[PDB]
Amino acid sequence: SMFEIKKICCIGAGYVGGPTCSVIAHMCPEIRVTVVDVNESRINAWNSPTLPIYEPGLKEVVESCRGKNLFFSTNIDDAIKEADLVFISVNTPTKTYGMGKGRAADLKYIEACARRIVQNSNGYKIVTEKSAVPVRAAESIRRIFDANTKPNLNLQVLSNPEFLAEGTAIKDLKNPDRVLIGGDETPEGQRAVQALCAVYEHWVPREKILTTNTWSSELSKLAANAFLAQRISSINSISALCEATGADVEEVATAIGMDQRIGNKFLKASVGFGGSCFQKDVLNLVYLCEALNLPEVARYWQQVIDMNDYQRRRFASRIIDSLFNTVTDKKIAILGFAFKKDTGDTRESSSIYISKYLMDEGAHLHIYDPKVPREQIVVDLSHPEDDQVSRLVTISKDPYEACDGAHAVVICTEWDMFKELDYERIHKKMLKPAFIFDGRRVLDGLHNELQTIGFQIETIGKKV
Amino acid sequence: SMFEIKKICCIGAGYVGGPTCSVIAHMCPEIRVTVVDVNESRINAWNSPTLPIYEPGLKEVVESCRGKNLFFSTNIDDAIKEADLVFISVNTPTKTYGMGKGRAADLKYIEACARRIVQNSNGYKIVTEKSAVPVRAAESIRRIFDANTKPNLNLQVLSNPEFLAEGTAIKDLKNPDRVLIGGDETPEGQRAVQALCAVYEHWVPREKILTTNTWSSELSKLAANAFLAQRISSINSISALCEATGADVEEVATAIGMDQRIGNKFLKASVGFGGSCFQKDVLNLVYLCEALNLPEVARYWQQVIDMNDYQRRRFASRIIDSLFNTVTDKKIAILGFAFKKDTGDTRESSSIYISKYLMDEGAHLHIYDPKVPREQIVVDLSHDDQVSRLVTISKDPYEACDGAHAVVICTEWDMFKELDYERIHKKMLKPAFIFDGRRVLDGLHNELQTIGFQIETIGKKV
Amino acid sequence: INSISALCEATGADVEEVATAIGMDQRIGNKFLKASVGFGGSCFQKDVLNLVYLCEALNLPEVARYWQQVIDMNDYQRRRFASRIIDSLFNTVTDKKIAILGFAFKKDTGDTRESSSIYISKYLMDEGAHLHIYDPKVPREQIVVDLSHPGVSEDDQVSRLVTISKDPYEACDGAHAVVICTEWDMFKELDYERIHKKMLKPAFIFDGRRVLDGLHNELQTIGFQIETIGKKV
């Protein structure tokens, strides 16, 4: 309102900072947006005709304003000096050792940015956390600024979390459900908050811009992903009950989802949710609870993970039991390795875990995924040159090789192609009894024809 | 359309059967709908100008078709003989003893109906469970029919659960989010399912009528109330974290609820959910899981109740710590006793539980609620000497607050934001606390701090 | 052998076939291998509990717990038998008439001490069952004592819920279930066709002693659901 952002700097040219800043430039022609990164190779790519990130619509957005008001540079320090607003958009990996190993977020990159910003800054700037951060991250940035102050240096700290999913990043940026901005409840804080609102007001309606305090903002990002993951674990818990009673989890999911207060999204049973966001955010929320002496809340959210873990384990057990509790040297087809369809991302994929369970039985796994690189599958199934993987794991170039001589076909990722395969042919060449374990309900409605063909076909959330 | 339902009999003239059948008759002029009950007094009332159930819109519906195609009668046996479709719409109270005491559903009334139906039936009929039943209830009706069969007796069993809330029953029947009908995956089951679909098709669009197997149908009713309860416990869990960090739970709930995949309903933090459906249904789910050797699933759903109970307990503890952990002969005002605003219903009301905690500290409660009858409050807080010594029921809020150390809002009635707080302050003992258990005073905070209250609320840091 | 009966019910093996096979090994012997709803009498539980207590007194918790299993198993065998009954009646037995045939701890005596009939009857009382109890030797006064809350000369629950029958046909007349808890030889000679006519349907016979073995097809033809210990349903 009073203050006007005219220059933005984004430290971090990854999957958050690049696209967000590209859309900001596209929508705000009068604002100069400079995306910076230490990685010279990456910056060069952003300035090339082959962008380092593939996202539908991104190329068009970047090419429409790069060189006009959108810039990519390795000159971090100059970008900061010039900036009115600086986004910090670096990753916060999970700690791999020490207090909170495996669960707590590691602020090392956030801290390095804060130190660098204060070292290169004079006068008034707004500094905004854009990466997924743990609650209190802004407190730390503020401590660093307060401890390294200079005359006439006035840095304001805001939180502005990202709500982007892979594959929908541009749509999500152009037409967001909401934009969330957190700042202090002081006149300074509210000045800063309003300045960044005005940026988003160039293309987002005021009623979709939610302003909060900084802790509410940070906590909403974590909490939102926990609520989404909870719906999957809840419908997965129902799937177990369906298998025991004769109910069908897709019928039940549809019935529950038609109540508009619950809604019909995120109610699809599966072998288990995956990706780099759901488990990580829930565990981060559980760690935070324990750290604040809220064990009841900690144990309440831990259930979302325990349930996902159980869902995977019981699926593996149905497989193994159906093979008479011996799978040593039995060939099994694993169709699908990505954590979900239409990606090559294997981070926390249920396919990894199902696979490790069968490896632990001596299975000879032939794994097919149309999009995941074969080197990645080998890494994911290896211990942190791995003999168990080279002894037990074959990566198949087509799905027929993977089923050929197999005892079971296990569908772990919901790629659409898997429902189109020649199952008559696959049946001829399998050992008998021939099983199909559908971990994604993707073969619904082929059931009768598959049983006619001769398969024992089994799925999640359906009684055998 | 092979088979056409032309006569419907509903056994049970209560809150479910009466209104549902009244709406069916209203919407299906060619169908004769006869609601029966053993309780002659109640039937008479359904035939009177003062219906035994108050529901907005119900009188108009009933008066528009009673005596034309809608009938209420104590002649249960004739209605069954005539009927093409018989609804069983009786209560299934929770067992009060024995295996599953306090959690399992008691099928005695459902069984009695089934046995009576088979005794009075010949030929083809469709029998449909309309009451909230445990999973496998239809199996039991089936077993009874199969065990007491007669030549040419062909009874088909369907599930058709109710999704009505008090106060919105007519709206919910005229314009339902969905109609759910479960039946066997056999030609005869599908024929039966289609006949009942056709009844609903007189006024509900086909895309809103969901057909399933019988177990899916029974399980969906229980699961829906459980998912809804989970949202409240989930946002309540966040409210604890807000109090510890400085986040505000209403800011967080808005942020979360604007994601269209989550939605913005049922995300209002409180001292705790209540009512006769949520805890009951979740507990029945937990019991069914244990029975079926699904302990992981059981413990997943118990968290919904354990969280609600913790929310109530930590709220009471805040109140108690604020008066130094000694409330004995302290006067405290409880404003609101209903489980939610705009009802007299106290079933599983968080006000009961808050109040019982303070009573266990020796607090003198003065309780006001604008619609709950006094005798209901006395019963709810009894096992009674602890009540008569410690509980006073006030005819107005100002009495209850007069000379109180604290004012505790437990039910979100709109009138509580309109009270003369300057007045209440003049007459309270100092420090004068208001504990808002419902976020109903949000936005009066600054001025209430100005007046001199130490105002505290759920999901906000002190 | 009771623990094996549970496994028989789960798999399709028959506990009497298994008992006979095990017992023909002369090192094991064929005595005391008869599956039941549970052992009773004034000796077994008391002596085993005494032994367990001695172990704990002597800091031998491993031996204590080894022997405690003989009791725990017996309690489980009782509880799961009652649960079969109750589950078969839809988990509600309030005001249902159920015949209890046999109250003595074993046949051919009036001794009821620690009889499994007392425990199965107490489980069905906790469901509100209306129990009609018949035994050819046990005095009626002793049954009333055995089911009463001790130190209560007139129990409200016993007089509301329990009827002592002077004949088995009275006990089964209008019953949902006939529960045989003691192995009296007379029970295999009963006129079951007659019993079936006047029972409510579905009509269950729960044989807690294997005393109706070989009658099963005949009882299924008459139209009973006949269930017993150590046979799959």
UniProtKB/Swiss-Prot annotation, chain B:
Q: Which UniProt keywords apply?
A: Acetylation, Allosteric enzyme, Carbohydrate metabolism, Disease variant, Epilepsy, NAD, Oxidoreductase, Phosphoprotein
Q: Which BP terms from GO are recorded?
A: chondroitin sulfate proteoglycan biosynthetic process; gastrulation with mouth forming second; glycosaminoglycan biosynthetic process; heparan sulfate proteoglycan biosynthetic process; neuron development; protein hexamerization; UDP-glucuronate biosynthetic process
UniProt effect for mutating A83T:
In DEE84; decreased function in glycosaminoglycan biosynthetic process in patient cells; severely decreased protein stability; decreased hexamer formation; severe decrease of UDP-glucose 6-dehydrogenase activity
Question: Result of mutating M307V?
Answer: In DEE84; uncertain significance
Q: Name one Pfam family in it.
A: UDPG_MGDP_dh
From the UniProt entry, list the residue stretches annotated as the region Allosteric switch region: 130-136
Q: Which residues bind substrate?
A: 162-166, 221-225, 261, 268-274, 339-340, 438
- List the GO molecular function terms: identical protein binding; NAD binding; UDP-glucose 6-dehydrogenase activity
Question: What's said on domains?
Answer: The protein goes through several conformation states during the reaction cycle, giving rise to hysteresis. In the initial state, the ligand-free protein is in an inactive conformation (E*). Substrate binding triggers a change to the active conformation (E). UDP-xylose binding triggers the transition to a distinct, inhibited conformation. The presence of an intrinsically disordered C-terminus promotes a more dynamic protein structure and favors a conformation with high affinity for UPD-xylose. The allosteric switch region moves by about 5 Angstroms when UDP-xylose is bound, and occupies part of the UDP-glucose binding site. At the same time it promotes domain movements that disrupt the active hexameric ring structure and lead to the formation of a horseshoe-shaped, inactive hexamer.
Record's disease association: Developmental and epileptic encephalopathy 84: A form of epileptic encephalopathy, a heterogeneous group of severe early-onset epilepsies characterized by refractory seizures, neurodevelopmental impairment, and poor prognosis. Development is normal prior to seizure onset, after which cognitive and motor delays become apparent. DEE84 is an autosomal recessive form characterized by onset of refractory seizures in the first months of life.
The protein here is known as UDP-glucose 6-dehydrogenase
Q: Which organism does this record belong to?
A: Homo sapiens (Human)
User: What is this organism's lineage?
Assistant: Eukaryota, Metazoa, Chordata, Craniata, Vertebrata
